[PDB]
Amino acid sequence: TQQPIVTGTSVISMKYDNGVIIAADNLGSYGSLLRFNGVERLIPVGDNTVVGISGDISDMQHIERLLKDLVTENAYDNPLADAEEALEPSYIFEYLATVMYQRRSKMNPLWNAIIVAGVQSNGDQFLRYVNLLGVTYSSPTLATGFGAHMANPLLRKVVDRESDIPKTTVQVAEEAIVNAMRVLYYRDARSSRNFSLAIIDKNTGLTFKKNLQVENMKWDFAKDIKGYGTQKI
Amino acid sequence: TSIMAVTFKDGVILGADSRTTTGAYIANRVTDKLTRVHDKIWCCRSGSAADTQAIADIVQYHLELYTSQYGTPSTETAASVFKELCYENKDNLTAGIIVAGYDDKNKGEVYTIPLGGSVHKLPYAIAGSGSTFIYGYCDKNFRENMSKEETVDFIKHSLSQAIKWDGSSGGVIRMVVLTAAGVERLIFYPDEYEQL
Amino acid sequence: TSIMAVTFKDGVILGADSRTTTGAYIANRVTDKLTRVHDKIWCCRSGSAADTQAIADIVQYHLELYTSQYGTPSTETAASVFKELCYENKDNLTAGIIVAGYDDKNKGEVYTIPLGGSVHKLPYAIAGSGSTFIYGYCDKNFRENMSKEETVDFIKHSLSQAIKWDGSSGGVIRMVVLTAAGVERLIFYPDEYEQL
Amino acid sequence: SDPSSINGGIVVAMTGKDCVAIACDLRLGSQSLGVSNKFEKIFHYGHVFLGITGLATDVTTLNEMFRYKTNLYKLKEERAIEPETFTQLVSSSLYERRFGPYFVGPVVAGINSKSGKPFIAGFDLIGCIDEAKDFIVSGTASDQLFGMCESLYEPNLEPEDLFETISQALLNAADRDALSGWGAVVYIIKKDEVVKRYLKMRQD
Amino acid sequence: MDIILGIRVQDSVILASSKAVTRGISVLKDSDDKTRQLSPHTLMSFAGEAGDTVQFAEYIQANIQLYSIREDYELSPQAVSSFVRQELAKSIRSRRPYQVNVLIGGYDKKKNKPELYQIDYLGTKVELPYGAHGYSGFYTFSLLDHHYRPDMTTEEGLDLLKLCVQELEKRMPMDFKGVIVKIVDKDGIRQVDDFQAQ
Amino acid sequence: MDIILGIRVQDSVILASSKAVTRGISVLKDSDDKTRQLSPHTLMSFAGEAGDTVQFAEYIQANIQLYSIREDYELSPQAVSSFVRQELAKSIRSRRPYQVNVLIGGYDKKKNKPELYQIDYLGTKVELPYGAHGYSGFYTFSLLDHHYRPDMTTEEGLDLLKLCVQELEKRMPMDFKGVIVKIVDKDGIRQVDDFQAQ
Amino acid sequence: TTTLAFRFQGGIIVAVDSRATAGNWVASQTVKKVIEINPFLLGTMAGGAADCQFWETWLGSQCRLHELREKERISVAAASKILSNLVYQYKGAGLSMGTMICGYTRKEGPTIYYVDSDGTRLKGDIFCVGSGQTFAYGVLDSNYKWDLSVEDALYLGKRSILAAAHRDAYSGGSVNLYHVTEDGWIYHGNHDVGELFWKVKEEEGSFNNVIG
Amino acid sequence: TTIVGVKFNNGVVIAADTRSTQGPIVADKNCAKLHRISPKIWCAGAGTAADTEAVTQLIGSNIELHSLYTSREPRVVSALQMLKQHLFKYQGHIGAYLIVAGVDPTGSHLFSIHAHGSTDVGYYLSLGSGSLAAMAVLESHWKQDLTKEEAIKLASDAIQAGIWNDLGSGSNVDVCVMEIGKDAEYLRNYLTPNVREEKQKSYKFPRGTTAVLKESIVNICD
Amino acid sequence: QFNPYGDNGGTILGIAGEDFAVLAGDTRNITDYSINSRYEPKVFDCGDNIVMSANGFAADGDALVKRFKNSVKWYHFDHNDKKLSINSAARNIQHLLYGKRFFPYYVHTIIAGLDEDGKGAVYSFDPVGSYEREQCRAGGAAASLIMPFLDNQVNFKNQYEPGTNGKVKKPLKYLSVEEVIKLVRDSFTSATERHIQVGDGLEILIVTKDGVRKEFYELKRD
Numbered sequence A: 001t002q003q004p005i006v007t008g009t010s011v012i013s014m015k016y017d018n019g020v021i022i023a024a025d026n027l028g029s030y031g032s033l034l035r036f037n038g039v040e041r042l043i044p045v046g047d048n049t050v051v052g053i054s055g056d057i058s059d060m061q062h063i064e065r066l067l068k069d070l071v072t073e074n075a076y077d078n079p080l081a082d083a084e085e086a087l088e089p090s091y092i093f094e095y096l097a098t099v100m101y102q103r104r105s106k107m108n109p110l111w112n113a114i115i116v117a118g119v120q121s122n123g124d125q126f127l128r129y130v131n132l133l134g135v136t137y138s139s140p141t142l143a144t145g146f147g148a149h150m151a152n153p154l155l156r157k158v159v160d161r162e163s164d165i166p167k168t169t170v171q172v173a174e175e176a177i178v179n180a181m182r183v184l185y186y187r188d189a190r191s192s193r194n195f196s197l198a199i200i201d202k203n204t205g206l207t208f209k210k211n212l213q214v215e216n217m218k219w220d221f222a223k224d225i226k227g228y229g230t231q232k233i
Numbered sequence B, C: 001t002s003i004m005a006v007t008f009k010d011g012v013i014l015g016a017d018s019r020t021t022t023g024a025y026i027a028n029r030v031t032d033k034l035t036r037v038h039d040k041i042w043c044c045r046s047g048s049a050a051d052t053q054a055i056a057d058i059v060q061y062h063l064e065l066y067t068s069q070y071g072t073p074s075t076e077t078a079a080s081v082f083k084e085l086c087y088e089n090k091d092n093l094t095a096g097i098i099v100a101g102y103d104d105k106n107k108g109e110v111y112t113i114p115l116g117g118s119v120h121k122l123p124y125a126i127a128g129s130g131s132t133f134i135y136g137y138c139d140k141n142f143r144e145n146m147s148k149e150e151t152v153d154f155i156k157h158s159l160s161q162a163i164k165w166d167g168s169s170g171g172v173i174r175m176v177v178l179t180a181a182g183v184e185r186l187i188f189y190p191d192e193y194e195q196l
Numbered sequence D: 001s002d003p004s005s006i007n008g009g010i011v012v013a014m015t016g017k018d019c020v021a022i023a024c025d026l027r028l029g030s031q032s033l034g035v036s037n038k039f040e041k042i043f044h045y046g047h048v049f050l051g052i053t054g055l056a057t058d059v060t061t062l063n064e065m066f067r068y069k070t071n072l073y074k075l076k077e078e079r080a081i082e083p084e085t086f087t088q089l090v091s092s093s094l095y096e097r098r099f100g101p102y103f104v105g106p107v108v109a110g111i112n113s114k115s116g117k118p119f120i121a122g123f124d125l126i127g128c129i130d131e132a133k134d135f136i137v138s139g140t141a142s143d144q145l146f147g148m149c150e151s152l153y154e155p156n157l158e159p160e161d162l163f164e165t166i167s168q169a170l171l172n173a174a175d176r177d178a179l180s181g182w183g184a185v186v187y188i189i190k191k192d193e194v195v196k197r198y199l200k201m202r203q204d
Numbered sequence E, F: 001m002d003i004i005l006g007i008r009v010q011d012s013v014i015l016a017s018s019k020a021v022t023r024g025i026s027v028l029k030d031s032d033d034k035t036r037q038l039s040p041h042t043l044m045s046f047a048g049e050a051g052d053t054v055q056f057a058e059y060i061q062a063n064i065q066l067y068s069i070r071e072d073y074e075l076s077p078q079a080v081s082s083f084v085r086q087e088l089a090k091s092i093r094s095r096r097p098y099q100v101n102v103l104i105g106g107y108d109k110k111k112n113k114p115e116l117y118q119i120d121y122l123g124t125k126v127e128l129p130y131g132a133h134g135y136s137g138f139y140t141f142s143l144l145d146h147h148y149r150p151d152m153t154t155e156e157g158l159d160l161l162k163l164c165v166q167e168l169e170k171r172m173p174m175d176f177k178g179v180i181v182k183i184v185d186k187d188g189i190r191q192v193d194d195f196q197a198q
Numbered sequence G: 001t002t003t004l005a006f007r008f009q010g011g012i013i014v015a016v017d018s019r020a021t022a023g024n025w026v027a028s029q030t031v032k033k034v035i036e037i038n039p040f041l042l043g044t045m046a047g048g049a050a051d052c053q054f055w056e057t058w059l060g061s062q063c064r065l066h067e068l069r070e071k072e073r074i075s076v077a078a079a080s081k082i083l084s085n086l087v088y089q090y091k092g093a094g095l096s097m098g099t100m101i102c103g104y105t106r107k108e109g110p111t112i113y114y115v116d117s118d119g120t121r122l123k124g125d126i127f128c129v130g131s132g133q134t135f136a137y138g139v140l141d142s143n144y145k146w147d148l149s150v151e152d153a154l155y156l157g158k159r160s161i162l163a164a165a166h167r168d169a170y171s172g173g174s175v176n177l178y179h180v181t182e183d184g185w186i187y188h189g190n191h192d193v194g195e196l197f198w199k200v201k202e203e204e205g206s207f208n209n210v211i212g
Numbered sequence H: 001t002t003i004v005g006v007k008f009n010n011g012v013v014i015a016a017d018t019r020s021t022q023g024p025i026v027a028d029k030n031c032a033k034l035h036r037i038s039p040k041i042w043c044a045g046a047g048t049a050a051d052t053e054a055v056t057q058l059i060g061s062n063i064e065l066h067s068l069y070t071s072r073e074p075r076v077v078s079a080l081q082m083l084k085q086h087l088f089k090y091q092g093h094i095g096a097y098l099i100v101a102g103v104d105p106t107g108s109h110l111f112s113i114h115a116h117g118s119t120d121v122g123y124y125l126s127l128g129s130g131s132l133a134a135m136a137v138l139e140s141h142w143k144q145d146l147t148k149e150e151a152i153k154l155a156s157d158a159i160q161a162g163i164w165n166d167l168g169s170g171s172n173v174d175v176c177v178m179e180i181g182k183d184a185e186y187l188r189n190y191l192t193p194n195v196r197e198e199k200q201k202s203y204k205f206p207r208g209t210t211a212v213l214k215e216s217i218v219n220i221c222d
Numbered sequence I: 001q002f003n004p005y006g007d008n009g010g011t012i013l014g015i016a017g018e019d020f021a022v023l024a025g026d027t028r029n030i031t032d033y034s035i036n037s038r039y040e041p042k043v044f045d046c047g048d049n050i051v052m053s054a055n056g057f058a059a060d061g062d063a064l065v066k067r068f069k070n071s072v073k074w075y076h077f078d079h080n081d082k083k084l085s086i087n088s089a090a091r092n093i094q095h096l097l098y099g100k101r102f103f104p105y106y107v108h109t110i111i112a113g114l115d116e117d118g119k120g121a122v123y124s125f126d127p128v129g130s131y132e133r134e135q136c137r138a139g140g141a142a143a144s145l146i147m148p149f150l151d152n153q154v155n156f157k158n159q160y161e162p163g164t165n166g167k168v169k170k171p172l173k174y175l176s177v178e179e180v181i182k183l184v185r186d187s188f189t190s191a192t193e194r195h196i197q198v199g200d201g202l203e204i205l206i207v208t209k210d211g212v213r214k215e216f217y218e219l220k221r222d
């Protein structure tokens, strides 16, 4: 039984016709103090899987070491470690899912919400969630924390049901995800303007974008708002 | 919330962010924490929105009546009515108020009313959650009798930093200039103060 | 407590106040929160005195053994051992540690280990109760690759402010310069930094 | 601890073709102990009916209150109160005690003497009004009544069918609730006559 | 709790009430009468909190006697029970409520029938063939549910009672020192001073 | 609590123990024997927590019987009482302590004298002419403090007891369903099956 | 839950209801509150359902193992102490069970043992356990005679549960009867309280209060 | 509950869902969360239903009496001050979260009042459990100078964001348009996107199925 | 403090026919007022013609199903691929559950299949292992809504033969698969109306001697 201290906020994602996209801002909050700014909360494992983590940063750093070891280990006595016997997104998830539930069951959880995004060897898109309680689920779109409330309603408009995935392109998708990242910057008091985004396309592979920024923000109308009811000037 | 009021050569200037949150959710991003209680007496509101708005609305009523009967009230007086409400109801109020006004004889004046309900008159005063992050900065950059520009800059910098560190602050930076010349509203957007 | 470590052109410098209080009483006014874990790897201690001293003493033991067997340890390694102790025992520790060391290949390096037990490598880092008051100041005055003098001044100013506002800080300001040239101890008295 | 679950009991009202039905159980207990099997929860003032589930003492109190009020109402208005008006009266009567309410769940049923239109409505303990066109449920076994109604129910049933439907909803709902049952009564209301029948059900 | 039982037979109402008064570790009295006569044909038994119990009963008594004097008429049991339920329903939402439960038994000289009323400190009132307050109900309701008949005579009823008092002395934890019985009928209220072995 | 009394007369020890076993609202048994024989001339009465009570007694029994078999000799009461005080003093500071109070009465065939021991779950042991556990002591100690004499006969003692059991039925809240009495002397342990009216 | 068991001339009678609740919610009216430990032993379920159903099935296993080992049917006094000691090992952990171990051994005759998770083990002639115990005691206590015919005793049981099922909100469903003889126990049907109540009312004239 | 407010070029529009609940049970599948304070000043309310209704009427009643006394159309700032001062008086115990809007002799207005009494002002707002779902849509499509039709669409969509994504919201969409020069138009059940599919079977019981014990007629005529 | 448990809503239903059985559940997974997924299967085919579902706290629900399936695997290894009887499965699950009697699986579980006579069979459990075989059973969030309906339409409770003066109870004629699927759809569309946690989709598994089949229907998404 612990309590998160340095934390990461939302992690949002969805899947398009050829893969998946996942993003998370680069903030490391410490209460209300926006203390750290170079935090990469997107962990790529191999080149067909990206793991986005939110929640306690120290635990995230720890899940990170577990992921790297999972890779180092898979290589051992594995002549096809970079081929037929390489790490699949589904293996990486199932592993974390296991670790997560075992830790909640020991009353010493890893204070996080995780989304494993990627493309399976047979092309299939992989997107699944797991949190400190060991709870898991899937959906054409997934978000943690604040994104669950604001990002999902938006992304779901793009891919509402399964049949919508093949009709969605990377442009449409990456767009929605970037707009969602903007909305979260407008209303989440624990968010940053800078974020990272990643795309795992069955054809183009893994495209990992860093240092992005929220642009095209409407603020102008802020000038026409004076007082809180009866004030005029 | 990040708020401050600075006196200078021509009078006084009030500044504030525009973020009001309820938890981690930003309830309003374009809030106006700069309230008018008289022609040239304004205040900066921090603490409970409901508490400060209700106190402000009452002070405004009192000063409107004060005028009708005895003419124009001093900035010190407006501070007194605030202080009176705040101290007398300390147990049911969460309001940190900064009172700034322009007088022709006194020029610029600033009064700060902290949670206890005590009153403090100063050259400048900062308050609100984000105010803690810029104590060292402001103490090292404030100077008495700066010019309107030097002051609009002192405030723009100070608040950009407060907004930077404090997650309970943000949005746009609003200002209000009080001088013999009149009353001027200023607004600065993220795109500007973020890169200072 | 007010502590920080800043990297610069020739390596790195560590600074701290010397006040350790138990309530409102200043238990020790001439404390040394600048601890040596290796020849050119030191740390800044904040949080529980007993917790940080105990952790420090253990890291020093580990690095002494690391040496005997594999030679000189990197600054990143010393940070790792600290981080290992701090994360693994998070539930019984109240320690905020800043790790700074001088390498010949990496020059100056700074790692900060906050309460959670996570590790952060940065150009400079501040910590301790008084650190909150100088977030805005330091962010506006720090510059990369400053000279030994520019850096000793950045730290002297930053800490004089932290000591000014935070009652949990005070006494004398202590510094430690780490460069290829060696290790230099610096001390500044109230009479000097108070009037800056 | 929970006032609305000391005595128990349920009430349900349904609308049919030019008719409305309202039924209740007859239990009155004190926790697990059953005390009376004759505690009816339906009352009427003129052609308007009122079912009241909840803490018995309040069920009695409100009945005496609305009797009193509807009486003076008839003396001054020189006509009997209508369902729609009575609903408003109940609501404000309850919200009057917003910060120390009567722990009850009222249900109103009747046909508007002037328009001939059927009318039923439910209230929460502080007067919030819910005016449905199909059915209103109330009591310790309200979840059950909801499942029963949402399924069984269909529009414009005849008085003879609506009886079967509301009786089946009531009965099967009550049988899954330890605090309801011990007998039941059902009222079938038409613009001209009102039939009151007692049902045969388990007594455990 | 204390033993407060009530049974309505053909032409009368019988009230049984424990005679013990225990305070902590000691049984201070074995001859206590937990009852008050409200009018020539109306009796009320009560049990509950230490002070409330008597203060309420006497208060209710005084008021019914006053109505009698003022109207030179005796209020029907039903009416008396309605006045009492009202008093308690007021009490329940007052500053310091009365924690008293009562059984009201009387003979309606106009309807020429006996009536039994059970009312709890909340103001819950119900009319019953037989009733009880406290735990007593727990062992006696099934007995009566089994052996009760509306046309029973006062004698038959007094036996059914003895049956209940027996089960209560057998299975109940506390020593309630026996009961005091009273009959209410067309002729008024009288006590069966011979039940300690009837 | 339950009734656990003990009185040591001239040439024997008498133990009286309530026969009731109540669980919440219902008295489940009226013929319970809250005692265990540890050896031919040593008897132990007990009262306390629901499980602990029997589990402790039988455990102590088994051990004393084992010592008897192993040594082909019967431990003196004093010794048996020292073994028991030790067992409880261990229990008191263990993980889940035994909440059992006991009275130990036996006849020392070597000293040719009866002995009575009172020991509580804490491991507090004291030797007494008469003693009791629970509240019983509260009404009986003054009776015995008044009417007790060391040279009383078993008959005199059995009367003094009847006196106590009477005060207890008079002033005690609970109906303990009478007591079971037992005598321990030079000839062993026997039960007075006629005290329900002796 | 209401469960009773009494000893008499004809042996032992065991009657229980079948209502299972979770608050005011009636989970089941079809629960088997009589665990058939074996052709000569019976267990009653009161308190926690799983706690009884499980640990009593476990008891059956232990008994069977005793017989294989000792080539001799286990005594009721011993089967009751195995359950008793097991349950006491968990004293404090929260187990919740009030039960009756009933049987007929040539060596003890008809015997009834009360066993609850408190560690209490009691031998006796009449026992009623459950939230409806007082209602069954009422009926049972005043109509019991060692000289009841195996037929009249069977009825008194069935009726004692009917009484409890009525008054107690947590009891109900149906009645389950068992007759304990040395040759073992004999089931005596499932009696839906739904119908049994009305029947008894009419035929017996009781429950006069209820309106029929 | 999901309620929103959107100002457009010549007025203001407010919308809301129609689901009411107690715990996880839907109390009313189609209740009205749009309240009329005066002919052209409507208030949308979230929180404790009975409270928004009651507080809405009280101020509505007083604004009417005030209107009559002064012989002037009601102002939205009047409803805003009477409302907030009432809520503040009750230390937040009256669980009312309101978005009040409308037109009056001084233009078109849009406000929001929180149960503790603080008020806000803006071009678009939302409250309720669907609060965030809606705001996500408003922050994504609101633009300055919307037309009456664009505003209704935006408002309507924001409410939908809640119906679908929020468990506390659902059923239908209620809209109310208040244009500077015309009569306010209340559009009850503007959208009804949740009509139950026809049941698989009819459950009409055969008469005589229910067992009755007794029967009788009741007297209604005095 | 850390709370190891959570609630993901959902509701399951199991009905047993004469030579078949069905186990259905909605496919919505929630957390408070948010929807985690509109489609996350809850009923599984564990083999040997046994369908199962542990509803409540998803993490515990999956752990349990997983553990059971693993049990069936070894049962085969151990007893030469012998088919695990539905009743044996039931007893095994009771041990899985009670094994954690002091740190329970927060789930209400139901399994369906065919007995050793070819008759439909449904088994339901306690979060701690108590189990009973039954004709039909609803479990989960809206169980209190569905069960009453089921006692009425599947076992004809409180239903009598017309005219017989409520003296002859309706006969227990048994339902066919077609008729049973109707009560399942109606049970869920009705539950979806009044329970905010029930909706999105209805996945049904049908077990016959010929194996296991799946049927899917949508439910309102509000």
Ligand SMILES: */C1=C\C(=O)NCC[C@H](O)C[C@H](NC(=O)[C@@H](NC(=O)/C=C/C=C/CCCCCCC)[C@@H](C)O)C(=O)N[C@H]1C
Residues within 6 Å of the ligand: G001, G002, G019, G020, G021, G022, G027, G033, G045, G046, G047, G048, G049, G050, G096, G130, G131, G170, I055, I056, I057, I104, I105, I106, I107, I108, I126, I127, I128, I130
């Ligand atoms: C007799 C009734 C009785 O004698 N007393 C009433 C109290 C009795 O303990 C109730 C018992 N009911 C049950 O055993 C029920 N099962 C449970 O209560 C299980 C509880 C598990 C708790 C752990 C938390 C789980 C949270 C899960 C969230 C999805 C029924 C269903 O078996 C009872 O009725 N006893 C009868 C025999």
Ligand SMILES: */C1=C\C(=O)NCC[C@H](O)C[C@H](NC(=O)[C@@H](NC(=O)/C=C/C=C/CCCCCCC)[C@@H](C)O)C(=O)N[C@H]1C
Residues within 6 Å of the ligand: D098, D099, D100, D101, D124, D125, D126, D128, H001, H002, H019, H020, H021, H022, H027, H033, H045, H046, H047, H048, H049, H050, H128, H129, H168
């Ligand atoms: C909007 C939904 C929303 O905004 N939030 C979700 C939760 C909301 O509170 C539910 C609300 N439900 C109701 O209003 C219901 N009634 C009640 O909640 C009544 C509460 C009474 C409390 C009385 C106790 C007072 C103690 C005082 C001590 C001094 C239903 C039945 O109307 C809702 O649906 N809100 C919608 C509009």
